[PDB]
Design a protein around this nucleic acid. Structure first.
Ligand SMILES: [Mg+2]
Ligand SMILES: [Mg+2]
Ligand SMILES: [Mg+2]
Ligand SMILES: [Mg+2]
Ligand SMILES: [Mg+2]
Ligand SMILES: [Mg+2]
Ligand SMILES: [Mg+2]
Ligand SMILES: [Mg+2]
Ligand SMILES: [Mg+2]
Ligand SMILES: [Mg+2]
Ligand SMILES: [Mg+2]
Ligand SMILES: [Mg+2]
Ligand SMILES: [Mg+2]
Ligand SMILES: [Mg+2]
Ligand SMILES: [Mg+2]
Ligand SMILES: [Mg+2]
Ligand SMILES: [Zn+2]
Lengths: 72, 106, 61, 98, 85, 140, 247
RNA sequence: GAAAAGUGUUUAAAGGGGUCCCCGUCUCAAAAGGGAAACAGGUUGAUAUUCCUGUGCCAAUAGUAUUAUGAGUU
RNA sequence: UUAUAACAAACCUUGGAAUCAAUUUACUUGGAGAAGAGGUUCGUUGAACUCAAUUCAAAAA
RNA sequence: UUGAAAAAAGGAGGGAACGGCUUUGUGCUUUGCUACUCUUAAUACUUGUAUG
RNA sequence: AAUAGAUCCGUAACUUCGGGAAAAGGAUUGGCUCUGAGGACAUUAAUGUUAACUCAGAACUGAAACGGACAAGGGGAAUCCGACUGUUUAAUUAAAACAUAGCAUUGUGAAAAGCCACAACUGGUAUUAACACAAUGUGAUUUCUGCCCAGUGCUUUG
RNA sequence: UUAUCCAUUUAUAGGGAUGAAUU
């Protein structure tokens, strides 16, 4: 499992066709934190956002053939 | 205390079967087998450890990226810098001496 | 046990009669020496760094 | 007798004169051209000795193979550490240059 | 306080083994555990590894030599003869 | 005297250029906040001309005797100076330029240097010993 | 009766050598064109313990004259050899401690070791720690040379036979008492199982000529003929004299 | 050696690596030596580092042809 | 190659040491280059460290 | 008493060999043009069914 | 049975000067309430936050008791044997037997040697080489080891 | 010396004057 910090890199990864599923998790922080996981054939890449709206926007951006798993 | 047991087949306290007791998310204390500490790769002359080489076991050395095995000198990851220097000096100076000897003869 | 430990902290149960290990077993002479030397040497190092003591003096001390 | 003379000369240099001992300093001196004469102990490890010789040749400096050990070369000078090679960069009253 | 008068290195042996034997050991143990003068680096660092093998700590040059001393007399004599030749 | 005069050939002792032989072009010997050490600036050969037979064809010979060069500023304490001096057989100022060490097209400069070296090897003159020395790969 | 301890040794079962940790056989160079007509120099790359031996070994590396590659010999180290010393071997070698020369080319008085008794034998005499032989003469006929072995014995060898100038390392190892039984235990533990030695006189008759009696005594002369058989040859074999040696 | 067996390079024409040369007895012998790679949680009446969920790791992966990925050379 | 941090070592540059110095619980080490100053690496370790991200504001190419 | 070996792996030394396509003559030589040599991953297709 | 743990004291003969030695032989020991000694850090010599556990001393206290159970040498003066640690008759003998270091003797210079094995070849010692291997005896140290070569053995000349 | 015997090595140049070393 890997972490991602460059949003652009994440986007690129998403664009790449072996990325079957996205996992999008909501977490009550000690505000609503959001973890964006992409499930690639090789690795499970995750991005952490402090900011909900940004997270939402990025989710929206994600290709609509991704197999989105809303965990909690 | 939480007690433990070997899980991998080898149930004796050998150098290969050394063990690091580790806490799980479950709360169970488990035993994890430590991969042995490898020997630092050494100089073809003085048998001192060569720098810039990850000391890895022969299994793990095969996988590691070529930068982690090599150093970019001449004799590289087989001879330390000091020794290399000395070798170079020998190669030059002795050659020079030979020439001098020849001159003397003639 | 906690009460006992508190009492020991105030020095209470420690005492000739309540003592079965040799002096070294109770608290190792070697460990005490180590402590002391480390304390002293550290202090010396500090002093020399501050320049409050000169090299020569430090070394002899 | 020769050895004694050499020792005396060394002493003289120490008293009045500019020197510096040990490989690196000596080499530096040679590179500069500041070295007038280098004196090298019997026990100086072969390669380094050779290097020193080469440097001297390049600078047309004298090479003097000191008869005695590392230890002696040091005792010959005022010093309680073993020496190996030293470079006189100015002779005072002393003759050793000639 | 200097602890032992006559014994020195053979205090480890204690009461056991003849006094004569311990005396002999003493010479040899002194010879063994001395740091000898290294003929290359100068430093008195040649201590004994194995029996006839003497490693300088400084330069790491293993000199073959005596079992107890670094140089036996016979060997030295031989060397001298060779030099003369 | 001053051992390392511009044009003298030296053997590098340290670094990636470990046992490579080279010509010094401009000595500095001035310690600074940037480079707190007397340094030499050197133009040398990494990959020497390979051994060649009379039997071989000319193009192939030329290919064989390509000489891959390098330009490196180096601590004088890392170089073994030689008796050999090539102030004559090269216009030395033309080999390496101080200013161009900084510049972007350093690889271009290196290439040019290499070409020059190759040319020199092709036309030796009468035949200097220094140049011969430079030609031969140091075996250690 | 039973088979005596001595007899058991020859079958070599537990009585074989403890060969496991030994570094290899100590041998001179093969006798090549080099060594016969000139000299070859090798580097002593390391000086090492060979367990069951008392004398340290020198791994000496030579460069093979007939194929590109370095090959290692195991020489017995003379005193004064050291790592990074060059050892030279051959007819026209120079006479220095360490070097390997035909006995013909060493003046009288020279001290030698690792001596081949026949040429090519890869060196056989004077190998034990401390020991040396002396060249005592070379005949006016040339050819043979007279040597004096550590025993005292004088022997005549070929002059072409090689040897090593100097004395073998680890001298005087016998000077220091073993003191403890355990140190002897450790000594033989690396050689072969010849230790403890129970006394024949402490055994029963089934076991040993000396065995039995209500007293612990040998009971019959303990000098036995050369021409005895296996279980008889037990006391002082073939003894020319006995008692405290006066000569 | 009558064989059965006894010895294992002692006087061999004893399979591998490269593009003819160069190496070279075979085989078995370690479930504590050497060694490619695994963890957690869950689950059964009875198995689990072996199933389940999840997360990895290791070793392969023939040729030819496209694609992309980056290097290097002009 | 977990990223980094810290630490025992090993090495590099500089520096040039007797009024010897650094230094360990222990002794070890030094003109074959010590201390000091700045680095490199392996090894422990496996999120230590502001570690990473983000918040906006100021200075370079 | 100096404290296994080998499989396996790695590093170094060394400098063997060297672009591709088209045309001509008996794998080699000559003539003309500039995307080449690697590299992982995916994909396709024949070859026994090419993942444990 | 007594002795025993610890702390403090004291510790002889004799000795191979290492030991003997925990010699012998004394004292103290609980609980409570205090006192003193012993660090780290970080402010700026004084003032802070703060940590073990150990030592030493003093009051009071009790049916004079306290290593309160548990656990834990009996010691000395000699003599005999074996120097010692070690090993041994599995299921009656643990020793004074064996071993041991030390000592001394003996053989052997080599693949035609020594010692031993094998039916035979061949092997072991030996990946060895006289400071070695083999074979005996005695059994640390100290101090010595006298006389006898006729008897028997071994051996040297031919 | 040719039988026989022993040794030595990869059966590796016919006899005399502490670098590298291969196509
Ligand atoms: Mg103590
Ligand atoms: Mg005995
Ligand atoms: Mg016995
Ligand atoms: Mg009996
Ligand atoms: Mg009988
Ligand atoms: Mg009896
Ligand atoms: Mg008796
Ligand atoms: Mg098998
Ligand atoms: Mg195993
Ligand atoms: Mg079960
Ligand atoms: Mg006893
Ligand atoms: Mg006992
Ligand atoms: Mg019994
Ligand atoms: Mg007995
Ligand atoms: Mg006695
Ligand atoms: Mg008598
Ligand atoms: Zn080295």
């Amino acid at each position: 499992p890997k972490q991602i910090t460059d949003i652009r890199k994440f986007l690129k990864i998403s664009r790449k066709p072996d990325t079957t599923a996205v996992i999008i998790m909501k977490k009550k922080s000690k505000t609503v934190i959001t973890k964006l996981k992409l499930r690639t054939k090789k690795y499970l890449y995750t991005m952490v956002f402090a900011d909900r709206k940004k997270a939402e926007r990025i989710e929206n951006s994600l290709l609509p053939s991704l197999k989105r798993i809303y965990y909690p | 205390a939480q007690r433990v047991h070997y899980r991998r087949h080898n149930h004796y306290n050998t150098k290969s079967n050394k063990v690091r007791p580790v806490r799980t998310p479950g709360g169970k204390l488990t035993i994890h087998v430590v991969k042995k500490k490898a020997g630092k790769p050494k100089c073809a002359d003085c048998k001192t450890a060569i720098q810039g080489v990850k000391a890895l076991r022969p299994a793990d050395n095969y996988r590691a990226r070529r930068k982690n095995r090599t150093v970019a000198r001449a004799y590289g990851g087989s001879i330390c810098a000091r020794c290399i220097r000395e070798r170079i000096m020998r190669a030059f100076l002795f050659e020079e001496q030979k020439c001098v000897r020849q001159v003397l003869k003639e | 046990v906690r009460l006992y430990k508190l009492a020991k902290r105030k020095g209470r149960h420690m005492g000739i009669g309540k003592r079965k290990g040799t002096k070294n077993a109770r608290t190792n002479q070697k460990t005490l020496w180590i402590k002391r030397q480390r304390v002293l040497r550290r202090l010396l190092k500090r002093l020399r760094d501050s320049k409050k003591v000169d090299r020569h003096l430090y070394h002899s001390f | 007798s020769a050895g004694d003379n050499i020792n005396a000369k060394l002493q003289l240099v120490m008293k009045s004169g500019k020197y510096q001992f040990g490989r690196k300093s000596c080499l530096k001196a040679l590179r500069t051209g500041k070295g007038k004469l280098v004196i090298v102990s019997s026990n100086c490890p072969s390669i380094q000795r050779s290097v020193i010789e080469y440097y001297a040749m390049l600078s047309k400096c004298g090479v003097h193979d000191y008869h005695g050990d590392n230890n002696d070369l040091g005792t010959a000078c005022g010093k309680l550490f073993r020496i190996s090679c030293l470079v006189i960069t100015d002779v005072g009253d002393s003759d050793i240059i000639k | 306080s200097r602890r032992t008068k006559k014994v020195g290195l053979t205090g480890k042996y204690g009461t056991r083994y003849g006094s004569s034997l311990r005396k002999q050991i003493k010479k040899i143990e002194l010879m063994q555990h001395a740091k000898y003068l290294c003929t290359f680096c100068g430093k008195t660092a040649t201590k004994r590894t194995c029996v006839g093998i003497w490693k300088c700590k400084k330069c790491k040059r293993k000199v073959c030599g005596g079992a107890w001393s670094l140089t036996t007399p016979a060997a030295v004599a031989a060397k001298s003869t060779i030099i003369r030749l | 005297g001053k051992l390392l005069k511009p044009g003298k050939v030296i053997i590098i002792l340290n670094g990636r250029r470990a046992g490579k032989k080279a010509v010094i072009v401009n000595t500095y010997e001035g310690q600074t906040r940037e480079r707190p050490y007397s340094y030499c600036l050197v133009a040398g050969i990494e990959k020497h001309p390979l051994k060649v037979n009379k039997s071989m064809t000319k193009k192939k010979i030329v290919k064989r005797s390509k000489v891959k060069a390098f330009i490196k500023c180096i601590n004088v304490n890392h170089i073994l100076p030689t008796r050999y001096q090539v102030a004559n057989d090269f216009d030395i100022k033309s080999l390496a330029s101080d200013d161009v060490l900084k510049s972007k097209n350093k690889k271009k400069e290196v290439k040019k240097l290499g070409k020059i070296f190759r040319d020199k090897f092709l036309e030796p003159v009468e035949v200097s010993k220094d140049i011969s020395f430079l030609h031969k790969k140091l075996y250690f | 009766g039973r088979v005596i301890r001595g007899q058991r040794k020859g079958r070599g079962s537990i009585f074989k050598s403890h060969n496991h940790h030994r570094k290899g056989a100590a041998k001179l160079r093969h006798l090549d064109y080099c060594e016969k007509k000139g000299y070859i120099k090798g580097l002593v790359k390391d000086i090492i313990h060979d367990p069951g031996r008392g004398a340290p070994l020198a791994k000496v590396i030579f460069k093979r004259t007939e194929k590109y590659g370095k090959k290692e010999e195991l020489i017995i180290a003379s005193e004064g050899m050291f790592t990074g010393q060059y050892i030279s071997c051959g007819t026209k070698a120079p006479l220095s401690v360490g070097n390997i020369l035909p006995i013909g080319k060493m003046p009288e008085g020279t001290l030698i070791c690792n001596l081949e008794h026949r040429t090519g034998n890869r060196g056989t005499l004077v190998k034990a720690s401390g020991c040396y032989a002396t060249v005592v003469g070379q005949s006016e006929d040339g050819k043979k040379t007279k040597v004096r072995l550590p025993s005292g014995a004088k022997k005549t060898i070929d002059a072409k036979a090689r040897a090593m100038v100097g004395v073998v390392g680890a001298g005087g190892r016998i000077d220091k008492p073993i003191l403890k039984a355990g140190v002897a235990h450790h000594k033989y533990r690396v050689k072969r199982n010849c230790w403890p030695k129970v006394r024949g006189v402490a055994m029963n008759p089934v076991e040993h000529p000396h065995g039995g009696g209500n007293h612990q005594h040998i009971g019959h002369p303990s000098t036995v003929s050369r021409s005895a058989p296996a279980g008889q040859k037990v006391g002082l074999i073939a003894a020319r004299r006995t008692g405290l040696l006066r000569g």
